[PDB]
Design a protein around this nucleic acid. Structure first.
Ligand SMILES: [Mg+2]
Ligand SMILES: [Mg+2]
Ligand SMILES: [Mg+2]
Ligand SMILES: [Mg+2]
Ligand SMILES: [Mg+2]
Ligand SMILES: [Mg+2]
Ligand SMILES: [Mg+2]
Ligand SMILES: [Mg+2]
Ligand SMILES: [Mg+2]
Ligand SMILES: [Mg+2]
Ligand SMILES: [Mg+2]
Lengths: 139, 175, 123, 201, 109
RNA sequence: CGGUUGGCCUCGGAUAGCCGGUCCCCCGCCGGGGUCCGGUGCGGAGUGCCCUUCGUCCUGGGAAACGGGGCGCGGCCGGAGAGGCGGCCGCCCCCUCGCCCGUCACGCACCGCACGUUCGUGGGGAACCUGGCGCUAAACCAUUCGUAGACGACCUGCUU
RNA sequence: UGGGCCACUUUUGGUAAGCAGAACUGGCGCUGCGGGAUGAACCGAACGCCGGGUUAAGGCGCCCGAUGCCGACGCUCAUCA
RNA sequence: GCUGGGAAGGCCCGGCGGGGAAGGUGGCUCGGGGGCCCCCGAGUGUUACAGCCCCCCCGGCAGCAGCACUCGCCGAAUCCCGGGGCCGAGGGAGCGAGACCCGUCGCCGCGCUCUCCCCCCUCCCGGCG
């Protein structure tokens, strides 16, 4: 219970706002509703941000509070987050969501045909699997 | 006087030069206002209460917004104010945590309206200054004075209650 | 090509979806994002709006109508139209067989179902 | 959408659910609301009971048979709240009130369907967790509803049958995963198409 | 073969509280619940299709019982879907709550 | 008389927590626990899933082959809260076609244009033809009764 | 026409009054319309018959047009809020 | 465009540095749990095996109310393009010809010719490689 905490160095994911879909490091805490916030490697300059707008990830950086952008930037780079994230499966889940949003009409047709054939094969294997698993004649 | 988010202005003014004193003195105020028109109005209000000077026999020689000197460093702010309730008037000292002086004064205005039902025409801000951590009195700021501060976000209430409006799964509040 | 009166000259490759060379209005087509590079495709010069304009026969020399003209309701596909169709399809279709699944895509039709909304669809 | 919208009343707040239901049923949209005994009301049980007893006190003293009818079932209490939010003295409001249908428990055209949820009326979303609330079933039973024990036993039966069906569905899902692991070598050509366009993380 | 129109609902007339203006109609299109999604539908043709007793002539077909009132979407009405449309004749009040087709005609995509 | 223009065949729920899967105990070889392993801004995802329709003809390739389709027959089981439903076996009768990638051509290609497209053999009401299986009643009045009654109503009797 | 009445502010008698009597301006009477649920007088605004656009006062859970904003910060639990 | 000829901020380990302190880093002392070795909690203090604030002897470079969405007021210091909706009232505007089938006219903004040279794609092309 409570595996993720708001703390200095905690990396959050900005979900809505002007910086939506971004990664952010918590620099400091301003009074119970906002955090001083800076993503130097994700192109978000330092500002105040609501906890209602951020969602906490599992990454924690290491720097003292209210440090400068060069310190938070080199702490991001040493064990860079842009490769831990993106090969986290939250990030590729987002990536799949956006390419599914960008999917065109001819792409939609090809997805329909592929998914139809795949479901045919899976369904036939399921039928074979259960008709083989019904081979039970034990006392 | 209504509100918004406030800006800090410095308004410098003087009485008009009569042929008795050819060089009247200048006076300067820091005034937290929605815009410079309200800033000049509040200047004439305050300076008319303090000195025997009116907008007719006077002028604004400068009215300019003070920008925040360090808008990326979280500061403590002490506000000395006076206001009047439905009964008589009271002096008061509040403390805030903010990035900007005008942000802390706006915070003070919304807080006084919340806690004492006091209106902005009732409030008079008489001092505002930047307090360090070891000089604060209020526990709501001293609890944030901690270098290794850490807390969760316990009960995340869903906000997009209408996208979707009808779903099949109940939301989750633990994250 | 787009014709000289603003109307678009389209063809389905008629052996795929039974759409000949026709005109169609720009306001009443939806433009998708899939391309066929049709440089170096010979378009006959006799493929104009006068070529595509409708034909009339009624009525020669007669003013009163009680007998009926049971002919000319059968719109005849002329031989020049058939050979123009043959030529332009013979020079378009091998390029369509090149890219995959496009002939099945052009055989299919477009439709809306219980999910997709047209303001969210990317074309 | 031309199908019926089936909502589960359990865990929802009365007036908020009633407002959502009323606007839907005016816009069209045949709505069924099942399990109206699970609807919550904010404020403590005693003051909700007192509000209902003041409503019970409201009576045409010349002819109580003509007077306001105090329905006791939780389904009819919810229905009367939606009636209060509708324009029911008109033909349009009467058509909407007919387009709505409410039930205590889940009767068996609807026990084998998927029930939806309105998060803008859910108690966990709209109330602070340190606040008292009441249950429409308990309130109805103490203002004179007769049938909360039979509804409870029938709901227990329904929950047992739903557990059996859910275990069947879980075995089917395990079989489908096993079948993917079996024939992945002949759907690898089709799987990568779906991964390319955002289906199948 | 296939639908080719988006389904909307006649929600009511343009109105204040105690005055209704029957020349404008309010439409709720399925799937759109903000203005910047209503932007797509902003000039589309829309139709109230209905049946009656007598037969009417059908363009390109034989006479049947279907009748159509044509109109088009004119602009957005307030922060959550909800366009307002303008029909050739004002819509009958028995059509409130019923289906209106939005036809993807004149196209800008 | 008109609406409508694919379907979702279902855990219980918790919200300061959830969901899924396995190795060792217990319940007349399934369900329950305890490990252990995953996932959790829900991907075993309702922002989800399933169906997907231009039709045929020659011709290959894999998918299939333990199959498809018979409002075709018969039988069995489950469902009572409003069951009006769902599921499985045996008999025979047609096809190895339908699903995916290809080869080949043809169909009114109706000459830019609207109500097209389903549900649908929709619901309701009269009438005609056509066969197979069946059935041959009550109510009210009038009359009696007086447990009833202003009148109606009500309670009764009438070839054995 | 020479019965007036109401409202801000001032004001006389009266414990007071939707009471009686004055001053000033505006109204109602003679005036519909948007809002105040409802209402001669309040708030907005005064009106030929219409289309488009935009507003005032007032609002925007549903009745009921409009917040179905991932609105901001607080305060408050009432067994007559 | 202006402003404190914006405020902050980025990079140049900013460099000679000079200080200062806690929402106190390392190092140490003490207290707890993991195979004498590791991390968390309490005191110590001034850079250390983190950092923060102020003054520079001077800053430099890039950018510049930012095409990293931190915080303004603007446009003689402001222009181009596109989309939706509603609407089409009016009906003899000819100074010239002596109007001739029928005013493509006024004002305003433009382009070419009555000068001569070029050059680039062309073309009934003429024969065509
Ligand atoms: Mg008189
Ligand atoms: Mg009086
Ligand atoms: Mg009078
Ligand atoms: Mg007058
Ligand atoms: Mg008036
Ligand atoms: Mg009114
Ligand atoms: Mg009132
Ligand atoms: Mg108007
Ligand atoms: Mg209202
Ligand atoms: Mg509304
Ligand atoms: Mg005209």
């Amino acid at each position: 219970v409570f595996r993720r905490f708001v703390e200095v160095g905690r990396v959050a994911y900005v979900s809505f706002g002007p910086h939506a879909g971004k990664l952010v490091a918590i620099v400091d805490v301003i009074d119970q509703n906002r955090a001083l916030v800076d993503g130097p490697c994700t192109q978000v300059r330092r500002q105040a941000m609501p906890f209602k707008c951020m969602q906490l990830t599992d990454f924690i950086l290491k720097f003292p509070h209210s440090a400068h952008q060069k310190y938070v930037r080199q702490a991001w780079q040493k064990a860079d987050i842009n490769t831990k994230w993106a090969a986290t499966r939250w990030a590729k889940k987002i990536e799949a969501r956006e390419r599914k949003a960008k999917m065109t009409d001819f792409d939609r047709f090809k997805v329909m045909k592929a998914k139809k054939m795949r479901n045919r094969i899976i369904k036939n294997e399921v039928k074979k699997l259960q008709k083989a698993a019904l081979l039970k004649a034990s006392p | 006087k209504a509100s918004g988010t406030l800006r800090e202005y410095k308004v410098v003014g003087r009485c008009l030069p009569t042929p008795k004193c050819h060089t009247p003195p200048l006076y300067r105020m820091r005034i937290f206002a929605p815009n410079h028109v309200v800033a000049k109005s509040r200047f004439w209000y305050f300076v008319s209460q303090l000195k025997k000077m009116k907008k007719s026999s006077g002028e604004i020689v400068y009215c300019g917004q003070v920008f925040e000197k360090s808008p990326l460093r979280v500061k403590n702010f002490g506000i000395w104010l006076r206001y009047d309730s439905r009964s008589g008037t009271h002096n008061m000292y509040r403390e805030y945590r903010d990035l900007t002086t005008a942000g802390a004064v706006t915070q003070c205005y919304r807080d006084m309206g919340a806690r004492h039902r006091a209106r902005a025409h009732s409030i008079q801000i008489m001092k505002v200054e930047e307090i360090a951590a070891s000089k604060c009195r209020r526990p709501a700021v001293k609890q944030f004075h901690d270098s290794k501060i850490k807390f969760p976000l316990p009960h995340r209430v869903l906000r997009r209650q209408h996208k979707p409006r009808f779903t099949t799964k109940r939301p989750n509040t633990f994250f | 090509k787009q014709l000289a009166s603003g109307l678009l000259l389209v063809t389905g490759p008629l052996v795929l979806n039974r759409v000949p060379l026709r005109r169609t209005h720009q306001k009443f087509v939806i433009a998708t994002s899939t391309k066929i590079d049709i440089s170096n495709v010979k378009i006959p010069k006799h493929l104009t709006d006068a070529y595509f304009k409708k034909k009339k026969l009624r009525k020669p020399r007669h003013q009163e109508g009680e007998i009926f003209d049971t002919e000319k309701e059968k719109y005849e596909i002329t031989e020049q139209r058939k050979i123009d169709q043959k030529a332009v399809d013979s020079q378009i279709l091998p390029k369509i067989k090149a890219i995959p699944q496009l002939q099945g895509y052009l055989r299919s039709v477009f439709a809306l179902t219980n999910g997709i909304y047209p303001h969210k669809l990317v074309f | 959408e031309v199908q019926v919208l089936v909502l589960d009343g359990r865990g929802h707040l009365l007036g908020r659910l009633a407002a959502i239901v009323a606007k839907q049923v005016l816009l069209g949209r045949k709505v069924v609301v099942v399990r109206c005994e699970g609807i919550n009301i904010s404020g403590n049980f005693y003051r909700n009971k007192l509000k209902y007893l003041a409503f019970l006190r409201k009576r045409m003293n010349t002819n109580p048979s003509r007077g306001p009818y105090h329905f006791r079932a939780p389904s009819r209490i919810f229905w009367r709240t939606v009636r209060g939010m509708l324009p029911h003295k008109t033909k349009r409001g009467q058509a909407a009130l007919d387009r709505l249908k409410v039930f205590d428990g889940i009767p068996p055209p609807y026990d084998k369907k998927k029930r939806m949820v309105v998060p803008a009326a859910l108690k966990v979303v709209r109330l602070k967790p340190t606040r008292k609330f009441a249950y429409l079933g308990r309130l109805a039973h103490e203002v004179g509803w007769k049938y909360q024990a039979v509804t409870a036993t029938l709901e227990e039966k329904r929950k047992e049958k739903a557990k059996i069906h859910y275990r069947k569905k879980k075995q089917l899902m395990r079989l489908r995963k096993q079948a993917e692991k079996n024939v992945e070598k002949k759907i690898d050509k089709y799987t990568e198409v779906l991964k390319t366009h955002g289906l199948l993380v | 073969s296939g639908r080719l129109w988006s389904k909307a609902i006649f929600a009511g007339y343009k109105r204040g509280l105690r005055n209704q203006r029957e020349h404008t109609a309010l439409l709720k299109i399925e799937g759109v619940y903000a203005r910047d999604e209503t932007e797509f539908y902003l000039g589309k043709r829309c139709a109230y299709v209905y049946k009656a007793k007598n037969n009417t002539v059908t363009p390109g077909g034989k006479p049947n019982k279907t009748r159509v009132i044509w109109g088009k979407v004119t602009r957005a009405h307030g922060n959550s879907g909800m366009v307002r449309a303008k029909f050739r004749s004002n819509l009958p009040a028995k059509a409130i709550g019923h289906r209106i087709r939005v036809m993807l005609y004149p196209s800008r995509i």
